[PDB]
Amino acid sequence: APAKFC
Amino acid sequence: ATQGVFTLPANTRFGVTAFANSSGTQTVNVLVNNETAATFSGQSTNNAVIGTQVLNSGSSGKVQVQVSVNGRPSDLVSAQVILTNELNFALVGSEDGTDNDYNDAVVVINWPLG
Amino acid sequence: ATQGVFTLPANTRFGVTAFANSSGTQTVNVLVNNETAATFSGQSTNNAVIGTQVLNSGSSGKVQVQVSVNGRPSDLVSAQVILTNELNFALVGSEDGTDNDYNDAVVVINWPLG
Ligand SMILES: *C(=O)C[C@@H]1O[C@@H](C)[C@@H](O)[C@@H](O)[C@@H]1O
Ligand SMILES: *C(=O)C[C@@H]1O[C@@H](C)[C@@H](O)[C@@H](O)[C@@H]1O
Ligand SMILES: [Ca+2]
Ligand SMILES: [Ca+2]
Ligand SMILES: [Ca+2]
Ligand SMILES: [Ca+2]
Numbered sequence: 366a367p368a369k370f371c
Numbered sequence: 372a373t374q375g376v377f378t379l380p381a382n383t384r385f386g387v388t389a390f391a392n393s394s395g396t397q398t399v400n401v402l403v404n405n406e407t408a409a410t411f412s413g414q415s416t417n418n419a420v421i422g423t424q425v426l427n428s429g430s431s432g433k434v435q436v437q438v439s440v441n442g443r444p445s446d447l448v449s450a451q452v453i454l455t456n457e458l459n460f461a462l463v464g465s466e467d468g469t470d471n472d473y474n475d476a477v478v479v480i481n482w483p484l485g
Numbered sequence: 486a487t488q489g490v491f492t493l494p495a496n497t498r499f500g501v502t503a504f505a506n507s508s509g510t511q512t513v514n515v516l517v518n519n520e521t522a523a524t525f526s527g528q529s530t531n532n533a534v535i536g537t538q539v540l541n542s543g544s545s546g547k548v549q550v551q552v553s554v555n556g557r558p559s560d561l562v563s564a565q566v567i568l569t570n571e572l573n574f575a576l577v578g579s580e581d582g583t584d585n586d587y588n589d590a591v592v593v594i595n596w597p598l599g
Binding site for chain 3: 388425455457471479
Binding site: 369370371 | 441442443
């Protein structure tokens, strides 16, 4: 469950 | 030009509602007099309401809408429209990607209430 | 003039949401090609969402919004506004009484979706 920011 | 920034009449209640149409999780911030007054968050590709609330425009009447996805500001388009000199709509669209449908978070502000 | 009637691009999905700001119970009918396709009901003086749904504009693309309060047709005002030649809003306010704030039921239609 790939989580990302910016 | 600057987009998503609206001058409301002072000390007036307004509704703000945010819709989603993107596989990206939308973060909407509503600022009153430069202070974050409300924050909505959600993901939907079927126009789901990801937040709704009543705010007061305060002494300055300045309301600003900001949209970001995973902490990346979306590009904004906006306008205000007034019907029979009474009913106010402030409208925001945003784009978090490349396809330019500008609906990824749609934000609607309306006043007066009651 | 006629109000609350909108020609959309054919066979297009669109959002429709209704707000309430009256002490009267608001009834909102949305017709697609002159046939009822959605109906919302609710009472609020706090801009509560009384309904939200996605519809298809069908082959004609004709969409009509009606508002009643306890069987009584409300006076409508409407307009459509398009942002960056892509994001569409169809806006309706209505008056059920005498103060003319025209927010008694506020209906917002937006497209494209997705
Ligand atoms: C990917 O996140 C693109 C994002 O979601 C698509 C399904 C579509 O709604 C597009 O407009 C949006 O930018
Ligand atoms: C009733 O007198 C009028 C009805 O309800 C009020 C609370 C207010 O919202 C008014 O605008 C509406 O027409
Ligand atoms: Ca997009
Ligand atoms: Ca989209
Ligand atoms: Ca009224
Ligand atoms: Ca009212």
